[PDB]
Amino acid sequence: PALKLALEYIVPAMNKHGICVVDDFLGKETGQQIGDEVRALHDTGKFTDGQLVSQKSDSSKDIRGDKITWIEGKEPGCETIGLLMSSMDDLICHCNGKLGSYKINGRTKAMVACYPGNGTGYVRHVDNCNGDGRCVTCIYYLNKDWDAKVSGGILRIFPEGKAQFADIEPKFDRLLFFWSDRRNPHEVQPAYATRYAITVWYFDADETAAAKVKY
Amino acid sequence: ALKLALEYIVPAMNKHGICVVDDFLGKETGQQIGDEVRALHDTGKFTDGQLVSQKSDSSKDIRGDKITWIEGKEPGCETIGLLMSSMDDLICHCNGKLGSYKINGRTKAMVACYPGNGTGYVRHVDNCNGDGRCVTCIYYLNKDWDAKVSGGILRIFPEGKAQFADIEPKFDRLLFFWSDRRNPHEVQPAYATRYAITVWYFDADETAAAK
């Protein structure tokens, strides 16, 4: 159940480590259907270059070489992605009061993302480094039978203050949580196979209000 | 010279584009280079590493090292100058055997220090746009470097293959690798003072064309 998972697994792992991996989040069938919807989005030319908070070159593949599309979840033809978003949101809202001082009251749309092999990736970066309100990063992976040895595309997280890192394979039906701020610098290492993932960022009430004043 | 270059560096570079040479100058010379570098540092002369296309006054999150440029003739840097003469000697006895590059120039020596505290260098390519730099050479100064505690590994991602090459920044180690988009690389977060000396060698034709 979403609730027992959130309280028994997600919250302790997030508070003690700032990173949480949940494998087999929705199951084989639902995960496959999500794969179908994203591949359809891709086959219809909806994807465009990933954007950076402060872009300087119009082509920035060497910072992040992924193709993107923003999904609200209600688009006809994206019902299963909408269900994924509903699952995630249901999970996050049942965490409030148990993620330190964070009070999540918002989220981005769902960023569907494709790294089209060919060594594309995302250099080490921090999702939220000026305090833009994003406190939790949530990523759902869709890549079946992913062999990192031949296809690469590992997400390496570098937890701040320690020489350790955490290598996250983009395995099918894997749900990843981690703090969005400077505690979790991370990079997508070069991918040599098509790499799909869906990301949702969640906002903290107070930090987002502050952010609105700052901007 | 001719021995090590023709018989080791040239094959390794043409086959893999990456060559490591351990115990290059020996502990005594390596230690003197270390002393000269750390002296330069303790003057406070080092400034923030710069990028080809710089956009913000501060760029630690791209590259967090502090550096200083040495010609090798500065009074007090004699052993660094010796390092450079050794490198140049090798490289010149490589001409015509390193792929098809005709090396006829080099930068000054970049003395670089990552000051622990998690600094590093995001994944990048040294020569993106054909600026002439064809061979990157780095000499490391770090005794008893334990990557498991201090990090600061240099991870290179040979273009075309998922495999990578992790290089510890070990004392008296000399690294060669192609500067262009074949060898994108990053300095993973370091948690100890990480010293290295870099020289970039220029290809005659590509440099003339770039200018």
Partner: peptide
Amino acid sequence: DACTLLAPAAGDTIISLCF
């Protein structure tokens, strides 16, 4: 600094949630 040069754009829209 240069941090925002690397950070992923968040989009133009924030969807309300939870409360």
